[model samples]
Target chain A: SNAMKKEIASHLLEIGAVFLQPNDPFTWSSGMKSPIYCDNRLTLSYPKVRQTIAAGLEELIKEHFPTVEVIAGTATAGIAHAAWVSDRMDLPMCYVRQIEGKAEKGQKVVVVEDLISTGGSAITCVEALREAGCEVLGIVSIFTYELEAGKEKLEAANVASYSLSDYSALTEVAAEKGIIGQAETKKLQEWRKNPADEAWITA
Target chain B: NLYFQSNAMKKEIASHLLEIGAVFLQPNDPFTWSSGMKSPIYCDNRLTLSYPKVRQTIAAGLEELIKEHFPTVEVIAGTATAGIAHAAWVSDRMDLPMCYVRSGNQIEGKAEKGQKVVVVEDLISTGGSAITCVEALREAGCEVLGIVSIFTYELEAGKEKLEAANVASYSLSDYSALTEVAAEKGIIGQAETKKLQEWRKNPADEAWITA
Candidate 1:
């Protein structure tokens, strides 16, 4: 339901997870911080809040990818959330590393992440999983930034991506709920509508 | 007073800690801490994950205390590195709010805003990191009411320092209480206990100072 999206957006605001600074320009690692930052990792430290988020993701997975045999999460920040949700769902889990695997094809690997900014990390995990004799079902997360280029890349690779919430939906709710004033929302919309680079900056 | 002498509370918590393997008394090769000091005991509350019942017990105790002490807090704040998991559980059990302070700045997350926060930690040794957390929270506009911990070493100097800084602190159990329980459980024999007591009385070595 759209209500779930709104519920997550509201929670994000309550926890101070969303940052909007179009005027001063918060910088990203790519050195482009036009107007917004989503630090959803904060939710993991709050078990109940994170559980709600995981439950939301679980619901999405069940509805969209019912036959998914395994759960894969993005690494570092995503590890705990993925572990908690996988544990809750009682499924085998793997995490995608930011870098491609160097060791034997599939010996020691786990996919644990809550969000994916680009399909680059997701693609790397898929390759690693397939090499290890595990089918790469589909990926689900609490949220995604949803850049068109990244979407196209994932589609090109025949990978299915599902998200509980995305920038488009979150922005719509933020505008309706007055999370940010009209002028600021407009600025955000413009920047997201025209994301500058294909590669993430690490400033 | 009525608040101080409740064996029921002590025993309940001690048993949970023991069951979870959160507390280990190894008098024989006294565990050396990061500070390089030899100690008769070591605690790894991270082991709480191995026992669901024990985790639930500790979380319940924290929830009850949060209600009694910080009814008006807006967010449950955790000191990062170790306290994150426990903070997560406490927040989940109470269905209240939660956030955590990082040891250093990271690219993720926004600067904290003025939220009424209740700082939490797994254990309090010197209160140094707790103090750092308080400063960070306050810098971010948070009104830090108090700090809660699973255990405290009860360093008199540390308590005095915190009091001077005006931060109210609470612990589920302290060194004396823990030692008493260890003695009863035969976890630490009398001779080792005496050695520990002596070390506590006159901890003048460089290693002790560092710890």
Candidate 2:
């Protein structure tokens, strides 16, 4: 999956869906300064990019949870991709904004998300579905930060997750394409470990 | 350049709504609207998104509506949140540029000045949301072609508002077709259906809440 990860990463960079800037960081809503900013929703505007993402998400469900019964999007951004994948796979689709539609009890569900940063939103979606009597298989996203906190959150929730591309692959592709230097790459790698720390910022 | 109302299309869409429980009927024990108005029926077209065949059919219907009516449309935009998903599907099917309007009158995708755009919505109540989207698009310098929706309450005020704004619109189905199908399917009695029809005449009445 390394080649596929890097390949998807390259497309994300090519389309400007994901950006790399270690020297000058971007602040998230949570006020954490980070080296990366991603908006996978931009993938919807380009046909090829949209198809690539839908196909990747479909494969994740087929491989991770073949018995998945429904595709539930995580509100705003996740809804569009979920629609595409649901139509492609011919599965019943719902979303996690209040578990928006009816999912029968004991039905297996896979939540779709655009990006998984801290995994809080995705985890909340899984829990919501579970509370609504759904057997949530896990989640699949276009990109993930692969942060330890996010990983632990999914594990704590007992939900499995997979991303088409992640920070590791993203930074690797950016470095290979001369978008970032080795020193910046190291800082990026360090930032992922303790993402909230100011030490990763290069002066 | 003219709109042709298709009863066959309307019936088909109404059946889909009933089959999926997207339309609720309870004239005797009505549901309260956000505006505190009493309503015997409530349409949640967002549930259509979860149904593959239904959503596809609705999208196809909207596509056809645009082709036959707003033939020169260059872009498809959704009224944010509810309208966004269907707009995505319609945009994909039509292979046109797609965008969505945010709450604060913001256009959020690839739209340019003078582009003829059609707005996609899940349902039209008072036409407030749809008009807001149209105004936003027009304010952004795009030529507002009008709107296409899954279902409409067909309220007189909503009709007047759209006409007053000089915006043309279409829906796969409306209040009449929905209640007619509900009565035929035995989902609601004839008396209940009649009351629903009357409710549309004065939807703001408090008597509906206790009827």
Candidate 3:
């Protein structure tokens, strides 16, 4: 777990992939910007980095969910990660789009994201995948903001959730590494410690 | 005599990029990407398909890299969109299984599942999208070996990111090396070449910072 967390955290930082500006907060589609953005999509431009991330992902899959038969990447950013990990593991790969029921009824299933905030888009993907007949394998991701309500929704659906790291882990790492001071760390911690009640609040 | 050095391959790849307009040196009104970053040059690798010869050259280069770096890969997986055609071509040339990642689709058939995949992409700037592909692959139960790309911007951050991820990646060419080759081939005048280096070194805040 240490190795996995280290790899995930370091890869993100190295890619200039993490944009932390709690003060300026990055606005998501849902209209929330607490102060962190993970640009995992940027890995496509770096072969070595992408390869490492792929290998790490494969290792995580093998170690955590050995029986997974297919990899379903969510649309846009998730697609590339799914493709690379699927190729490395020799598993079949698919992507979940935000669109509703584009595929046949039975093909709809649940998949995860690299990061989850509002879980709105992720829920859409889950609904689409479930409608298609594929068993929802629960969602696994590299990181999660870990909103309690979101977790409850996923748990209510009996969808398993896994993450290589979470907001707490990242904040802890950042604080220990001097990436952020105690003040910023506490701010991030507070955000993760308390779950937002309004699911529709745009971030 | 058929053996090609990395530099030779870089030159060849650079030339192909130039031929297909994948490589552009526009200092005037730089192109802005969706990420909100300004670039003096834009390499739209998607255009490589328009030129058969150029596409072939890149594919061949990729095949050669695989032979050298990943000879044991069971199959070649192309990243969605741009990587699909190249992956298919490379798989055919090498007589290997082929698969592609869909950018976003949750359905079973709409996504290609099963196959030992070797991720292939045209270019790498930050390695973000590639990570997405890797995640999907793992969830499906395939053992990924590494990723192969035709070119890399070789930014310091990108390199560090890949290293942290623990993947073995190989690129045909990097920014500085390609610039040198371009200068030698007269693809870029010496003055313009210098300008390019300056841009890379001091990248304007507006140009380099990603939103």
Name the best candidate (by TM-score): 2
Tens-place lDDT per residue, model 3, A49-121, is 6566667667777766677766676765665565556555655455555332123334323353667766766
User: Per-residue lDDT of A52-109 in model 2, one digit per residue for the tens?
Assistant: 7889899988989899889998877778788889888998888776766668899999
Off by over 4 Å in 3: A98-112, A194-203, B1-211
Write down the worst ten-residue block by lDDT for model 3 chain A. A194-203
Overall lDDT per candidate, in order of appearance? 0.65, 0.84, 0.65
Worst 10 residues of 3 chain B by lDDT: B104-113
In order, the interface RMSDs are 7.2, 1.6, 12.9
lDDT (Cα, tens digit) per residue for candidate 2, span B1-211? 1233587789889999888889887888778777777788887877887788888999899999999889998988887687788988898898776777877127765677999999999988889999888888888899988889999999888999999899998888988888777778887886676577778887876654444
Which portions of model 1 miss their true places by more than 4 Å? A1-26, A33-36, A41-52, A58-114, A118-140, A147-162, A168-203, B1-6, B104-116, B202-211
Top-DockQ candidate index: 2
Which parts of model 2 have CA positions greater than 4 angstroms off? Answer: B1-5, B104-106, B186-194, B206-211
DockQ for candidate 1, please give it: 0.17
User: Tens digit of lDDT per residue, candidate 3, span B100-165?
Assistant: 666524212122345455788878887886777777777787666789987787766666777777
Model 2 iRMS (Å) reads 1.6
